[PDB]
Design a protein around this nucleic acid. Structure first.
Lengths: 122, 130, 72, 52
RNA sequence: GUUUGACCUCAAAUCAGGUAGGAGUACCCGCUGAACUUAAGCAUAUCAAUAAGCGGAGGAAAAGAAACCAACCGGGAUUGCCUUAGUAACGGCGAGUGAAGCGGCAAAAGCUCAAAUUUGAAAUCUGGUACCUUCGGUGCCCGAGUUGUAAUUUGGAGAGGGCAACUUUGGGGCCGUUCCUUGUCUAUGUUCCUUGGAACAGGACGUCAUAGAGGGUGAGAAUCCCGUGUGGCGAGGAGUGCGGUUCUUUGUAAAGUGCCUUCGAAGAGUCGAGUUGUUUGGGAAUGCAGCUCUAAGUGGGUGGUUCCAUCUAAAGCUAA
RNA sequence: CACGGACCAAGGAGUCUAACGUCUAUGCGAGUGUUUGGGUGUAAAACCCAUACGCGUAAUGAAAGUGAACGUAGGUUGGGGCCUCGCAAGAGGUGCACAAUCGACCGAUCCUGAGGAUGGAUUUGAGUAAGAGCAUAGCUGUUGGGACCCGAAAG
RNA sequence: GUCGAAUUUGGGUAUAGGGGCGAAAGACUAAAACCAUCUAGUAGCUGGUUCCUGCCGAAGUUUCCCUCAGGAUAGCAG
């Protein structure tokens, strides 16, 4: 009546068509298989925390965080430097303010520590 | 092309590498218990659930004791120097157990060490001896 | 713990302040406080420096140069 | 190259066709119309034991 | 002493040892930069922060561990994909330009200097030189260096002591496995009749098939040959990923945990302000460049309706 | 008139894509869309899928904001069908979609004075008034791209 | 005034030369060759546009936005 066509530039030079969608899925699965073949008994990814999303819109939702904290790791009963060797992602810049999020993470860490089998250095 | 045209024409020979079948099937290396029990006909995640071990700690996008006992089996299963020993010999023979006097001695406790350091090191000396 | 006091850096800044002397405008500024007062002193300082919050800290700094040099 | 090559199809429509295709494997007259020399066999759908 | 000697700065040498240029250039990082065109004729604008030109790198480059986003019940380096979304914003509000946070997912990894005395000891390093088990090590010597090389410390703090009768321990071989390169072995008709120059065709009879992919062979050949499929046996290397066996470990040596006790710095011609020019979706003046002027430490920056929140700049590295 | 056409062969011009739209087909339907990805695979095929997201299910106002049933979801006027009677014609009841007119609610818009109340009158809307859309495919239209094929006074 | 005019040219070897204004210095704003790219540069035009049959089948016009252009929108056929 509206329409805006951004074809005033030399658009025909930069046209990326993703024919390799099927090729790149295979490539990532081969990558995962290789990583799991090198990291044999371990999962494939670090233990990630539970986290509340920002903004009025999404604060209903609970999502994965980057890492726990020095606080959540200490309350679980271990050190940050040792947590990384057991494959627990640690976030130094994140803060602890909500009690429900805190306790959920501590129990996630505690249940993780019961389920694991750490190999000796010998 | 320009260079490829010559290389497909020359008597040098191509450096042909047939490394395509090796891209899919990479042998498991880091653990011999897993190396013996890994069905290569199955995938990565299928070989994890077959053994029991959790492959991804976050819940995946999409739709999804035989060996772990053997692991559990193999997982349930600092001396002193000549000069340090002879130093503790001197301290015990001159004092005995009076750690206050033992650490206030300038002649034998040349490094002005505490009482706790002395009783710990002497008990290491006493366990290795009679 | 925004600007943690740091007894040593307060000493160092004030130690260099007395040794280095004053910049030619600050040299005018301290003459201008004694003769014309803080009114015109802040006016010149604001034109010289960037903002008004700059001129506050600077004229007060120069007033402490005067407060120490004259009395104690 | 940026010609359309792959075709998006509805998923339930795709499953409609796959169900219909199974449904037509046990017709015995569509099996003869499709090709398949199926005159000298007992019954359709043809089922063999699991030992196969 | 009108002498002799320290330094400082600046030179030279076919001195000893090194290193830079050129090529390639798809992608990648910069610099520099148009026009045809399109907009109603048209200084803005548009094509376009494009092409051409110039420099600089690698297998990726760049980016990157917040002077980040937000306003939440808060998230948490970068990068990439779907989404945001032709949305917010810009624009003779015209032609047109045009994001980002959130959410999902791919992949994920963290760190290091400078600034506080090793001062019971420059603990550091390069070169020369003689040996040895040589991507190095050891001995001796000339030096660099206090205008600061080492150890400790980087905000997640951290450091010096004291207390647990608190917890732990390095390095090199050899042989296996991992990987790379390379060699070799592993099924069944050349049986009959007709056509044909020739059988690999037609027909008749059979085999092997985890092999009926392909090619060759005098026409359409699983069964003639090479191959294929399935496993087997070797050779030479790379290497520290781990599995064994084995030789070394040391010295009042190096750490970690929790508590007590005593202290405790954080990047200036930089931020900023003005200013001309460029540039952006950035009206909030978005980034940058030049020029004038030029700060502070209960600092300073960036956001949000009296204040509040969140970062730590002006130093550096880092896979996917 | 003029312009093309000596003869033959072969080549030789409404194509692809993006965006938006109509009509038709198909799947599901107040929902709908797997294919960003993940899992799986006999391996670019096929077959499964978590979390979100897109469009729709609610609009109005500049924004703050507010937010669609007095009634059997409403009365009157028509209305394919169906139902009762009619040996038939015909009469009556019920009335689907849809069309006209008088009303109820949402939104902003003034009196009433209970501060903003109960009630009063219209204006606005691509309103509510018992949903109709989402997705794929086909014919196709408009606009942007070299854009039906060849040609221009060039910077 | 009048590249007067190059006669006379082998080899080597240079410096210049396009515009209004302005005393000059300087600035406003216009508009000699070839090769390759940007470049498929711009069409209010010329030329051309590829098989068959069946059926239906116009208009060549009013009014409106004035208009030359740029065309936009009731009738006829669906």
């Amino acid at each position: 009546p509206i329409l805006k066509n951004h074809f005033r530039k030399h658009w025909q030079e930069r046209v990326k068509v993703h024919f390799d969608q099927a090729g790149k899925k295979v490539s990532r699965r081969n990558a995962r298989a290789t990583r799991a073949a090198k990291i044999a008994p371990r999962p494939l990814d670090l233990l990630r925390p539970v986290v509340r999303a920002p903004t009025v819109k999404y604060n209903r939702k609970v999502r994965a965080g980057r890492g726990f904290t020095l606080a959540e790791v200490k309350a679980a009963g271990l050190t940050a430097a040792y947590a990384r060797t057991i494959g627990i992602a640690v976030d130094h810049r994140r803060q602890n303010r909500n009690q429900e999020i805190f306790d959920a993470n501590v129990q996630r860490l505690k249940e993780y520590q019961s389920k694991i089998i750490v190999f000796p250095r010998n | 092309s320009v260079r490829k045209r010559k290389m497909n024409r020359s008597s040098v020979g191509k450096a042909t590498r047939r490394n395509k079948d090796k891209q899919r099937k990479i042998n498991i290396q880091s653990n011999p218990i897993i190396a013996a029990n890994w069905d290569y006909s199955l995938t990565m995640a299928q070989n994890y659930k077959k053994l029991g071990l959790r492959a991804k700690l976050q819940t995946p996008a999409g739709g999804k004791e035989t060996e772990v006992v053997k692991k559990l089996e193999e997982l349930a299963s600092r001396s002193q120097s000549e000069r340090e020993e002879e130093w503790l010999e001197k301290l015990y023979k001159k004092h005995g157990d009076d750690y206050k006097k033992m650490f206030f001695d300038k002649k034998l406790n040349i490094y002005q060490q505490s009482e706790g350091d002395l009783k710990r090191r002497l008990l290491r000396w006493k366990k290795r001896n009679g | 713990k925004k600007g943690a006091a740091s007894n040593r850096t307060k000493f160092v800044r004030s130690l260099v302040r007395e040794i280095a002397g004053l910049s030619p405008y600050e040299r005018r500024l301290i003459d201008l406080i004694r003769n014309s007062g803080e009114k015109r002193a802040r006016k010149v300082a604001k034109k010289r420096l960037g903002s008004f919050t700059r001129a506050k800290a600077k004229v007060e700094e120069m007033n402490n140069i005067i407060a120490a040099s004259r009395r104690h | 190259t940026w010609r359309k090559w792959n075709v998006k199809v509805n998923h339930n429509e795709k499953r409609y066709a796959t169900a219909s295709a199974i449904a037509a494997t046990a017709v015995a007259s569509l099996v003869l119309a499709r090709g398949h020399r199926v005159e000298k066999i007992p019954e359709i759908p043809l089922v063999v034991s699991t030992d196969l």
